[PDB]
Amino acid sequence: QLVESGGGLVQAEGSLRLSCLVSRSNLMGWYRQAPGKQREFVARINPTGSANYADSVRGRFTISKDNSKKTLYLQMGSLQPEDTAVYYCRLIQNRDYWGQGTQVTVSSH
Amino acid sequence: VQLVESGGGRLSCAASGILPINVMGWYRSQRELVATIVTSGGSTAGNTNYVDSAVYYCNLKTRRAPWATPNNYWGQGTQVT
Amino acid sequence: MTEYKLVVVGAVGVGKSALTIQLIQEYDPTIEDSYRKQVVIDGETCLLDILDTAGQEEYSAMRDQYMRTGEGFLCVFAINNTKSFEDIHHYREQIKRVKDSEDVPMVLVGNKCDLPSRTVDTKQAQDLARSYGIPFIETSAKTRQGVDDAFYTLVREIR
Amino acid sequence: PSADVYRFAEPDSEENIIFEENAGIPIIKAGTVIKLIERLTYHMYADPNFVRTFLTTYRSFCKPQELLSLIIERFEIPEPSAELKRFRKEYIQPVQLRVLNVCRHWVEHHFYDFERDAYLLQRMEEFIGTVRGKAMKKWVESITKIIQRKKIAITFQSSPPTVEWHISRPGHIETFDLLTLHPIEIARQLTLLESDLYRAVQPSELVGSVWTKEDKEINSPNLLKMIRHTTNLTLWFEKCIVETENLEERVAVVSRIIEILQVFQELNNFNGVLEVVSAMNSSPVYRLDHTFEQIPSRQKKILEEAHELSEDHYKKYLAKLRSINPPCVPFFGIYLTNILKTEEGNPEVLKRHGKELINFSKRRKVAEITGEIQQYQNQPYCLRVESDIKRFFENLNPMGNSMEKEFTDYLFNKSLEIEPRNPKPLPRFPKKYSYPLKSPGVRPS
């Protein structure tokens, strides 16, 4: 089993969308590592109820999964400079399956 | 327990003498920490703690549960230059 | 002398307490001698420390604590009880999580409480035991047949 | 009398009754059921411990309606004049007077036999009607009163201490949680209801291992209620730890739980002490090395103490309980295993000479464990009920609507996310508690 990612680089106020391919009582989310700083939680979906977001990103980001297609998205909207980080995909079922983490750097133009 | 060094002056210090949590180390004047690794436990599964990298000693903190007071055992000494 | 701490897990009413008594043996379970036994397995003499908790099954949250104290496990089921055979993999899953390993020493023990007729084919049990990569031993309380065999074999997997 | 028109006459013998060894009052090891009744109603002396033990444990070898029949057979003495006068002052009188003492003890300490069987109660009132003779027409005045009394289904000795409050204000049930109630008042209130759960367990629910078979719910209801209570707090403690995703807030929750433990150990609530030790031992909680790394060393000792109780087949625990002085809430789980092992490692019918006897030595041992459970059930606790908090803990449903697998698995996945394995490094997580995380401490006034 593996975990994947799809994103890139874009300017401020953007709308970058991220993907994961997972290839049941589980929990999955996103984490980002800003350079020189500690790894950070951004958001999760415990399928039990709904999803939680990090305080940095309350109303700008949104998580989801198309159970039909083994995929998981973080929608990034109203982006800023501060969210420049490698962005990891992560699924805890009975093991911590992490992901390599696509880069996302945002400029102001 | 008994830690018995070898090689002389890559040192070596496995031991024998049961505890599910263990931090063996190299404590190398006035001695201080030079090296510690963790073997079999919780989150600190294989973490590795160095000082900044001379009579070397071998360490072993022994503990049954993450909240139990340890039992540290030292070596004999392996000074070299 | 080496000492082996063994934990008997299983569903209620498969006779895990019956199995332990019959290894050690009026029985009084207060005394210390009621759960330690000096035995000689394969020439080597050792001391079996046996943890059996039958009756505390409803204390479900306590299972992780007890299981942790031991280094081998008899995973017992009853042969007239099919549910208990099905419930066996859950104990193996739980024992693994706690010891923190995928190769914890365990043997699968199928007990004959003679009460209704057998409803678990020894085929199934072996087939199950083959997958987990562990020994399978069928025991009888009312006959001591293969009680000494389950326990000694567990000590062998530990070794 | 005759050996045929009165069966309780067959002389003693090594196929009728065996006594124990070791000094002037006999102790039965085994005996046929008839012999066992005879000794329960012996002319020469009364045996209160036999009567107590027998009425507690007979149902496993003689059904309650059989017992009543024997007890009447024992009462209908037949007649064989000078050394038949002794046969009234010394025999029939003591026997008949010792049947009626049975009936009084029976109908008064084991009345559940008659709750569950109206006809058994019928026969008894019939039988005590036939009782005449102004010698007992006063025992029957005592039994029939008892019967009627039984058909009719705080007074603190000293001053309780003042009821500690910490963040949550009285009357604000909606803010009640682990970190906002006062740690001293949590342990007090839990201990309060945990003791009341413990005290509710009737020996009808233990004898016969009946909590381990198909009708445990009909027969062992207050024991199960008591076990399910301590299972829920252990799980709540666990859910409170691993659902605190932030490392600093978690060390605050673990800290506050160890503090509760502390007051628990002060109150001699070994049940609640073990709720916490089990929590701390579960495979989600135990693996969080980073979180224990920051516990005040004085606290690590407090927990180390409690966990060592459990170690070595509960040796240190067993010691401490026999030393502490009530009030006290013991850990029930040990008596559960001792009662099963005892009933399953001793034969039901010791056989001798070719006939079965009833192993009453095995029954006596079970009775002793039951008795020991009761000695800790009589002294209550000098603490005041805070009914708002009692309702809060009464309602704890940490498992939600989840089955136990789903939830146990969830609790483990949660510990995985908040402290990952060696390679992947420790992420940092938002705070969820909005109040301050400083323990009010565990001292009163």
Residue numbers in the entry:
A (entry chain N): 3 to 25, 30 to 115
B (entry chain C): 2 to 10, 19 to 26, 28 to 38, 43 to 67, 96 to 123
C (entry chain R): 1 to 25, 31 to 164
D (entry chain AAZA): 570 to 591, 596 to 653, 671 to 743, 752 to 1043
Q: Could you pull the original sentences from the published paper?
A:
RAS GTPases (H-, K-, and N-RAS) control many cellular processes by switching between an inactive GDP-bound state and an active GTP-bound state and represent the most frequently mutated oncoprotein family in human cancers. In this study, we exploited the unique properties of Nbs either to disrupt or to stabilize the SOS1cat•KRASG12V signaling complex (further referred to as SOS1•RAS) to modulate the nucleotide exchange rate of KRAS. To highlight the power of this platform technology, we describe the discovery of four representative Nbs, including competitive disruptors but also connective and allosteric stabilizers of the SOS1•RAS complex.
Nb14 and Nb22 were collected from the Q2 subset of yeast cells that were co-selected for the simultaneous binding of RAS and SOS1, and BLI experiments confirmed that these Nbs can bind to the SOS1•RAS complex but also to SOS1 alone. Nb22 is a fully allosteric antibody that binds to a different epitope on the Cdc25 domain of SOS1, opposite to the catalytic site where RAS and Nb14 bind. Almost all the interactions of Nb22 with SOS1 are established through framework residues of the antibody, except the R101 side chain of CDR3 that is involved in a salt bridge with RAS-E107. Indeed, Nb14 and RASY64A decelerate the formation of the ternary complex (k1) to the same extent (~12–16x), while Nb22 accelerates its formation (~4x). As expected from positive allosteric modulators that bind different allosteric sites, we also observe that Nb22 and aminopiperidine synergize the acceleration of the SOS1-catalyzed nucleotide exchange.
